[PDB]
Write a protein that binds this ligand. Structure first.
Ligand code: PNS
Ligand code: MG
Ligand code: MG
Length: 85
C-alpha cells in the first residue's frame, strides 16, 4: 500500500472516523478527533505497523495537527526513526 494511504488508514482507525481521509487538512485536535490517549495509541500503532518509533517527547499538537501534517512528519522521520537490526 502507498505509505501515505497506509498512514491515513492507521489514523482513521485510531480516530475511528474516516473523515481524516476525506479531509486530510482537518484540524485533528481542534475537532476533538484525537486526545492524549489517542496520541499514545497512534504512536504505538505507527511503531507496530511501520517499525517507526516516534518518542512521545517529539510529538507536538501544533506540528502534528492534521492528517497531511502527520503523514509529512512520519515521512521525514521514517529513515532515522526506524528500528535498526
Ligand atoms: O497528554 P494529554 O492528552 O494532553 O493529557 C491530557 C490530560 C492531562 C488531561 C490527561 O491527564 C488525560 O488524558 N486524562 C484522561 C485519562 C487518560 O486518557 N489518560 C491517559 C493520557 S495519555
Ligand atoms: Mg501529548
Ligand atoms: Mg525527543
Amino acid at each position: 500500500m502507498d505509505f501515505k494511504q497506509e498512514v491515513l488508514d492507521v489514523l482513521a482507525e485510531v480516530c475511528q472516523d474516516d473523515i481524516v481521509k476525506e479531509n486530510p487538512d482537518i484540524e485533528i485536535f481542534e475537532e476533538g478527533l484525537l486526545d492524549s490517549f489517542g496520541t499514545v495509541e497512534l504512536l504505538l500503532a505507527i511503531e507496530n505497523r511501520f517499525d517507526i518509533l516516534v518518542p512521545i517527547t517529539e510529538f507536538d499538537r501544533d506540528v502534528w495537527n492534521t492528517p497531511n501534517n502527520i503523514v509529512n512528519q512520519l515521512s521525514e522521520l521514517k529513515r532515522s526513526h526506524h528500528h535498526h537490526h
